[PDB]
């Protein structure tokens, strides 16, 4: 399929993994398990349907109503 | 005119149509190679023997093309993509960033 | 346009001006690579990851060139040359014969 | 040079080398010495200046006058 890849390995079982350029987006996190990298993309609550302003906490993924 | 050389190029996956299977990064600096592989040979340019031979042939039979300026050292990047059925998986992609150019 | 493949080419050392330092062979079949690296991509051609990316970009920004068709597998030969003292040396020269082509 | 090579090597001292596309010329011959294939190009004696027809014995290197 178009571009060709090899899935990444990693060494330390069960600990958080920081991949430059991937994992620095607040909504993406990885953890090394089974010698390979399992990552997740967190999902956010839909929010009060009358919010006019929205802010996200430093390092936070989901935005919330400022007001 | 201008001689073989690396050049800037930022590649943006949305623009390329891939945003829908590549979740991250949103893009990257691929760079590219462009420029002439000239005659007289240019001492500073990396060329295989064959390229040198071909430059010489070109110099008298111009239906034979000059050597081409192409990537000659590349490097990998990591991408986070969606498999067959929505499983986020992390892979390393060889030969994605042009590190240096040469005549081939 | 015809697409990236290998083509026959016999190079005659006497013609490129080299017979004065190369005593054997009088020439050899070097072949060369020529043809378009197209879009849509063609399944049968071999392309580096970066070449595929560059093909897509080109399809949208025609000032970024297409990937270039070049030799991707080469093999060596033996020649009997002639040093600064007329001594007769037999050397191996890498990268002189095109075994296969690809988009890079 | 313009094109780049490296000196070839061989194993056995005093072995007659058969090198494809070099050695098949009846006038060139190589032998192994100092782990290096040394080759020689034989030279042919000038022939009678009144000769009108030369000939080469099957696979011989030098032409001789046949008439």
From Swiss-Prot, chains B, C:
Q: What is this protein called?
A: Bone morphogenetic protein 2
User: Organism, per UniProt?
Assistant: Homo sapiens (Human)
Its subcellular locations are:
Secreted
Residues included from the entire protein: 293 to 396 of 396
Which residue positions carry a glycan here? 46
What's the stated role of this polypeptide?
A: Growth factor of the TGF-beta superfamily that plays essential roles in many developmental processes, including cardiogenesis, neurogenesis, and osteogenesis. Induces cartilage and bone formation. Initiates the canonical BMP signaling cascade by associating with type I receptor BMPR1A and type II receptor BMPR2. Once all three components are bound together in a complex at the cell surface, BMPR2 phosphorylates and activates BMPR1A. In turn, BMPR1A propagates signal by phosphorylating SMAD1/5/8 that travel to the nucleus and act as activators and repressors of transcription of target genes.
Tissues expressing this chain: Particularly abundant in lung, spleen and colon and in low but significant levels in heart, brain, placenta, liver, skeletal muscle, kidney, pancreas, prostate, ovary and small intestine.
Oligomeric form and interacting partners: Homodimer; disulfide-linked. Interacts with SOSTDC1. Interacts with GREM2, RGMA, RGMB and RGMC. Interacts with ASPN. Interacts with MAFP5. Interacts with FBN1 (via N-terminal domain) and FBN2. Interacts with type I receptor BMPR1A. Interacts with type II receptor BMPR2. Interacts with SCUBE3. Interacts with TNFAIP6 (primarily via Link domain); this interaction is inhibited by hyaluronan. Interacts with ERFE. Interacts with BMPR1A/ALK3; the interaction may induce HAMP expression.
What disease is mentioned for this protein?
Brachydactyly A2: A form of brachydactyly. Brachydactyly defines a group of inherited malformations characterized by shortening of the digits due to abnormal development of the phalanges and/or the metacarpals. In brachydactyly type A2 shortening of the middle phalanges is confined to the index finger and the second toe, all other digits being more or less normal. Because of a rhomboid or triangular shape of the affected middle phalanx, the end of the second finger usually deviates radially. Short stature, facial dysmorphism, and skeletal anomalies with or without cardiac anomalies 1: An autosomal dominant disorder characterized by short stature, facial dysmorphism, skeletal anomalies, and variable cardiac defects. Distinctive facial features include midface retrusion, short upturned nose, long philtrum, high-arched or cleft palate, and variable degrees of micrognathia and dental crowding. Skeletal anomalies include patterning defects of the axial skeleton, characterized by 11 pairs of ribs and brachydactyly of the fifth ray.
Tell me the superkingdom of the source. Answer: Eukaryota
> What cystine linkages occur within this chain?
4-69, 33-101, 37-103
Q: Which protein family is it in?
A: Belongs to the TGF-beta family.
